[PDB]
Amino acid sequence: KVKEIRELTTAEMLDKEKQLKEELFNLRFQLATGQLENTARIKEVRQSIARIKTVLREQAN
Amino acid sequence: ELLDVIKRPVITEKSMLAMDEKKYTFEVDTRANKTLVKQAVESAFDVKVANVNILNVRPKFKRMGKYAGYTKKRRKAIVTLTEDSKEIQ
Amino acid sequence: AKVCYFTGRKTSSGNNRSHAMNSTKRTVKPNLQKVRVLIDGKPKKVWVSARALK
RNA sequence: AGCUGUAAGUAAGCUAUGAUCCAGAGAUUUCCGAAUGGGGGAACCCAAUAUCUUUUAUAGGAUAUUACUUUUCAGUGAAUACAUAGCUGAUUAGAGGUAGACGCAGAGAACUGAAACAUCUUAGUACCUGCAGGAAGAGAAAGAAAAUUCGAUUCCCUGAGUAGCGGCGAGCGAAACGGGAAGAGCCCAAACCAACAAGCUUGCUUGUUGGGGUUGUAGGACUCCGAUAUGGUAGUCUGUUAGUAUAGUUGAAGGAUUUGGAAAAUUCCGCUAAAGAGGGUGAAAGCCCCGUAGACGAAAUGCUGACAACACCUAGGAGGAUCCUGAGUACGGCGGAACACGAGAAAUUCCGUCGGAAUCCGCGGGGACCAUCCCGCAAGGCUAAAUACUCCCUAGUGACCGA
RNA sequence: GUAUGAGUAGCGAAAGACAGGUGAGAAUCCUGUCCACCGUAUGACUAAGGUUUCCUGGGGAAGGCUCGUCCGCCCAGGGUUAGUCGGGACCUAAGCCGAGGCCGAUAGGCGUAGGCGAUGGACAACAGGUUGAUAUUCCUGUACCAGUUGUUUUUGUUUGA
RNA sequence: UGCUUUACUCUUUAAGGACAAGUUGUGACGGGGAGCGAAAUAGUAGCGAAGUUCCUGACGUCACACUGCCAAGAAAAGCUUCUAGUGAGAAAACAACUGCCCGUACCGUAAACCGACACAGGUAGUCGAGGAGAGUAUCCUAAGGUGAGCGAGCGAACUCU
């Protein structure tokens, strides 16, 4: 789904990284209180952060 | 980095007593100070002053299948408030 | 008195015989002298062998 | 077309938009450790200077720089005027690990043998220490020889347990001719000529370039004529193509019966082979599977060649007045080590100390030394192959092992 | 690996008895009663040292010199909050490392300037309550130290400010 | 103007300076307390009387204060001045905020440390009550803590105390 990520200006990249950090923090707190049938949504957030950082290292030469 | 300070809340039998006097028990990562935990909580939940306290933990044993090995380190954080709540938990 | 600034003279070792050829170990050292010489215009003190003072 | 390691369990999910996996390139890489801002009882603590940050503000957070030594250049600089220590900044290189292996050096034992033990042997071995390299070391005759000669080094067979050395005792122990492996030769210093700088002796003395020049049949300068070509390379991380290494593709041919829980076993009747090597499948399979013979295949990164470019490097003939040919070096005394050679009648090689040559009508060597003859130019450098080893990587083999 | 010795020696200084529990099972676990022992210690607090043995609830194959429903044993959860205490962001003694440097076959040896180094200096909080486990840490009351913002009585950096 | 020091003149039962345990108030309407005690699983939650006089009295504290003796008894920082000095102007007052890293469970004359052991051994410091008593000696006891991790019978030799 990287094709979506290469379309975006460098500000919106950073905005999506901040949104992913917030969602990852809320998924931590919802693990700790015994919830979340969806436990495999966590890898998606980490790997989306990874893909955005690799793209922002690429377009920074 | 300001958002990877806190990991979890500590939900234990003392901590449920601490919920009455606005005192909350979190697991803060190592190499963190008191002042970062103030800054992270205040920029994460709109709450205030009245100082944090910080512990440490020595690890233990477990022996599952005849293989001896430790567990992690920890660091609790017992945070008190002035005027708000965190009725999420 | 370790080495020479000019030649390659330095200490070493060798045997020692005495009239029925028993052998011990010596130290045969060069003659060396501290002379004030001119390194690159600046005067310096350095160890110089008595052979190369001719 | 299944997948989320080891590894069962459940929970959640992903894939025909081609997941999981395989191969070549990328990106990230906490803290310690040569550890390198300062300190330290390693995986810890505390700083400085700039810049950006939260807070009304101080405390807080992040990023980058800050060790030591020399080799180059600045500026600063005095006991002392002049400049030298010294200081400050920038710049270049090092610093530690192995592969318990192979090489070169420094320093260097004892038990043991001699049926004891001092010279001797074990043995320049084990151990330590410095220095590297994929190899190292040695290398282009001051040589081997003794007629009739041959032309850099290294490695193998033979010479041979021979000549020799040894309280002539235990023992130690070569070399040349001869046959093979592989083959390769180059570059300076000197004399001389200019251009610069300084001393302008305004003698031509020193330093810096550029030329010149490299040898024993002596060669070069120097003069005179020439010619102004010919030929090789041990060079480029320059190109164009060929090959190869790191994932892969395809790849032939059998049925039934009896004993079986299960057939590949057995029995009739067939088929294939550039494939009858091997492994697995419910017991022993050419024809069930994975493969083997054979043919095919690389976007990416190396590696090896070939020939283009580019860099180099190199000439004849005659003359012999003058000039040059490696200095505290060769060599001698005294004290020790190397050569098979233990001072012996002892050349040849080094090391310590003290004496101390010649310049082509010259010098060294042919196992003290002299004469004659013969063979060679020391005291300046570089150099591929033939040879030794395997931490590791791939593919294999074995009258090697089977808890 | 298994015998003989052999079901032998030993069971590591002491005072217990009864009633009632729980339990498949009780001298050995729990509760009550009286008796007994130390009491400059067999009582209280701490420095090293040990490294989760501490608390709560379950278990009995092995450990416990017998037994064991029990444990410092096994399973599963959970507890160790500091401006003032002790140490660091302060100082040095014995000793050690030691830029340059002085020596030395290599390796290295020794030392100036500077540092490291408590057993020693110097330094701001007391009383009570609280829990199953922490308490000069948590809360209750009254304090103190070093600072930062916001308000409130002085200028020639000459300095007497 | 700090500090040192010489020479001279006054002053001394003095005056001045420095230090000081410990008392009385406040802190403190507070918590603390013999005993009472429930509504429910609780001696729970909750409720409180008095704080008197004499005797003995500390090497604990003043404080290494004083006298004596010879064996002649650590450093550096924190602290206080005086000037060099850079060099608008802060200096009390009140209010409101800021204060980092590491150790805090447990045992600790022992069953948890050092002895291979749940071992008759060893372990630095502080507190350490009463009757007699010089006393921490000895005998019995308070606060407290323990009753030993094999027993039941019999009451010979023999060995030990």
Coordinates of C-alpha atoms (C1' of nucleotides) in Angstrom, one line a residue, chain F residues 13-149:
Chain F
rU13 C1' 39.6 41.8 91.3
rA14 C1' 38.0 45.1 85.6
rA15 C1' 35.9 46.3 80.9
rG16 C1' 34.9 44.1 76.1
rG17 C1' 34.4 39.7 73.1
rA18 C1' 33.3 34.5 71.9
rC19 C1' 30.7 30.0 73.2
rA20 C1' 27.3 27.1 75.9
rA21 C1' 24.3 22.1 77.6
rG22 C1' 19.7 22.8 79.3
rU23 C1' 14.9 25.5 81.4
rU24 C1' 9.5 28.4 80.5
rG25 C1' 5.8 29.4 76.9
rU26 C1' 4.0 28.3 71.9
rG27 C1' 3.9 24.5 68.8
rA28 C1' -0.6 21.4 71.1
rC29 C1' -8.6 22.5 70.6
rG30 C1' -3.7 17.8 68.3
rG31 C1' -2.5 12.8 68.5
rG32 C1' -1.2 9.9 72.6
rG33 C1' -4.5 6.0 77.4
rA34 C1' -5.5 1.8 82.1
rG35 C1' -10.1 0.2 80.5
rC36 C1' -15.2 0.1 78.3
rG37 C1' -17.2 -1.6 73.8
rA38 C1' -20.6 -2.8 69.4
rA39 C1' -25.3 -2.9 64.4
rA40 C1' -22.7 -7.4 60.9
rU41 C1' -18.7 -10.5 59.4
rA42 C1' -15.1 -7.8 66.2
rG43 C1' -11.5 -6.7 71.5
rU44 C1' -13.3 -4.6 65.3
rA45 C1' -15.0 0.2 64.3
rG46 C1' -15.7 3.8 68.2
rC47 C1' -15.2 5.8 73.0
rG48 C1' -11.4 7.9 77.6
rA49 C1' -9.2 9.0 84.1
rA50 C1' -4.5 11.3 85.5
rG51 C1' -0.3 13.8 84.4
rU52 C1' 1.7 14.6 92.2
rU53 C1' 5.9 14.8 95.8
rC54 C1' 10.7 13.0 97.7
rC55 C1' 15.2 9.9 97.1
rU56 C1' 19.3 7.9 94.2
rG57 C1' 21.2 9.6 89.8
rA58 C1' 25.1 8.8 84.8
rC59 C1' 32.7 8.9 80.8
rG60 C1' 25.1 10.2 77.9
rU61 C1' 25.9 15.7 77.3
rC62 C1' 28.6 20.4 78.4
rA63 C1' 33.8 18.7 76.4
rC64 C1' 40.1 17.4 75.0
rA65 C1' 36.3 21.8 79.3
rC66 C1' 40.6 21.6 83.4
rU67 C1' 45.2 19.9 85.6
rG68 C1' 49.5 16.8 84.7
rC69 C1' 53.1 14.0 81.5
rC70 C1' 56.5 13.1 77.3
rA71 C1' 56.7 9.0 73.5
rA72 C1' 55.3 15.8 71.6
rG73 C1' 50.0 14.3 69.1
rA74 C1' 46.9 14.4 59.4
rA75 C1' 45.6 17.2 55.1
rA76 C1' 42.4 20.1 51.5
rA77 C1' 37.7 22.1 50.6
rG78 C1' 32.9 24.5 52.5
rC79 C1' 33.2 29.4 55.8
rU80 C1' 34.9 35.1 56.9
rU81 C1' 37.4 39.4 55.6
rC82 C1' 40.9 43.1 52.4
rU83 C1' 42.1 44.8 47.9
rA84 C1' 43.2 43.8 42.7
rG85 C1' 39.3 43.6 39.6
rU86 C1' 34.8 43.2 35.5
rG87 C1' 31.4 46.3 36.3
rA88 C1' 22.4 50.4 34.5
rG89 C1' 20.5 48.8 40.1
rA90 C1' 19.5 45.8 43.5
rA91 C1' 17.7 45.6 48.3
rA92 C1' 14.3 44.0 51.7
rA93 C1' 9.0 42.7 51.8
rC94 C1' 4.7 39.0 50.7
rA95 C1' 2.1 35.8 47.2
rA96 C1' 2.7 31.7 43.8
rC97 C1' 5.7 27.9 41.7
rU98 C1' 10.9 24.5 40.8
rG99 C1' 14.2 21.0 43.0
rC100 C1' 17.8 15.3 39.0
rC101 C1' 20.6 9.8 39.5
rC102 C1' 21.5 5.2 42.9
rG103 C1' 20.0 2.2 47.7
rU104 C1' 15.4 1.3 50.6
rA105 C1' 11.3 -6.4 50.8
rC106 C1' 13.6 -10.0 54.1
rC107 C1' 17.5 -12.8 57.4
rG108 C1' 21.4 -10.4 59.9
rU109 C1' 25.5 -14.1 67.8
rA110 C1' 22.0 -17.3 62.1
rA111 C1' 17.9 -22.9 59.3
rA112 C1' 18.7 -17.1 54.9
rC113 C1' 26.6 -14.9 56.0
rC114 C1' 31.9 -17.8 56.3
rG115 C1' 32.4 -23.8 57.5
rA116 C1' 30.3 -29.6 51.2
rC117 C1' 25.1 -30.1 55.8
rA118 C1' 18.7 -27.1 58.5
rC119 C1' 26.8 -28.3 61.5
rA120 C1' 27.9 -28.1 69.8
rG121 C1' 32.9 -23.4 65.6
rG122 C1' 33.7 -17.7 63.7
rU123 C1' 31.2 -12.5 62.8
rA124 C1' 32.6 -5.1 63.4
rG125 C1' 29.0 -1.3 66.0
rU126 C1' 24.7 0.8 69.3
rC127 C1' 20.5 -0.1 73.5
rG128 C1' 20.8 -3.6 77.2
rA129 C1' 15.5 -3.4 83.2
rG130 C1' 14.6 -5.6 89.0
rG131 C1' 15.8 -7.9 94.2
rA132 C1' 20.1 -8.2 96.9
rG133 C1' 25.1 -6.6 95.1
rA134 C1' 31.1 -2.1 94.1
rG135 C1' 29.6 -4.4 89.4
rU136 C1' 27.3 -6.1 82.9
rA137 C1' 30.1 -11.1 88.7
rU138 C1' 26.4 -15.0 90.7
rC139 C1' 20.9 -17.0 91.8
rC140 C1' 15.8 -15.9 90.5
rU141 C1' 12.7 -12.7 87.4
rA142 C1' 10.0 -7.8 83.8
rA143 C1' 9.6 -6.2 78.8
rG144 C1' 10.1 -10.2 75.0
rG145 C1' 11.2 -14.9 72.8
rU146 C1' 11.6 -19.9 72.9
rG147 C1' 10.0 -25.9 74.5
rA148 C1' 15.1 -28.4 70.6
rG149 C1' 12.7 -32.2 63.8

